[PDB]
Structures are given as C-alpha cells and as structure tokens.
Design a protein around this ligand. Structure first.
Ligand SMILES: [Mg+2]
Length: 34
RNA sequence: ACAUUUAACUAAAACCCCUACGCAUUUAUAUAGAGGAGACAAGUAAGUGUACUGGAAAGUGCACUUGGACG
C-alpha cells in the first residue's frame, strides 16, 4: 500500500469462547442415545 | 552638357545651359472579423518537466524533488 495508517494490535476474545465451549462439550454428558 | 568675342589717341563693352518623382520608399489613419486580460458578480501525500487520451473536469506513462508519512 502507498499509505498505511498506524497499526494497532487488538486482542480477540471471540475465539476463546468457542475453544472453551468445545473443551466443555467434548467431556459433557448427554441424554440416553440422544 | 556648355563655353572669350569686341576693343585698346583716356579705357571699357559682352558674359544668363539640361534633367528628380514613382505602378518607388516610409510609416501611420479607419474600417470585415478573430482572440485575450481586467473589473463587477458570485484509498491513490504534494509538486517540476515532458508526452498521450479527453470537449472539458482531469487521468495515466517516464525521470526528478521533499517544500510529506514511516512510533
Ligand atoms: Mg538531479
């Protein structure tokens, strides 16, 4: 790019949610045959 | 181009040429029209030179400059 504005690095907190939900769903108990 | 005759017992008389200039030269005066400047009035950073496209508005190509940015 000819002109790039100043770069700001911002943490993303929308990924930890899905990671932790998958972690919980991988060991959670579900209904009989459901 | 044109031109020294008369006179002279004191001494004087006579003396008279032809051509420049225009359909040239020099500027200026006015007018057919055309075009200017001034006044009034109302993301691609920025430039220089050059070139092409476009009716314009502008865009793009090549080189150059910082009179920009880069914590
Ligand atoms: Mg130079």
């Amino acid at each position: 790019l000819r002109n790039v504005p100043p770069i700001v690095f911002v943490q993303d907190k929308g990924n930890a949610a899905l990671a932790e939900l998958d972690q919980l769903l991988a060991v959670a108990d579900f209904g009989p045959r459901d």
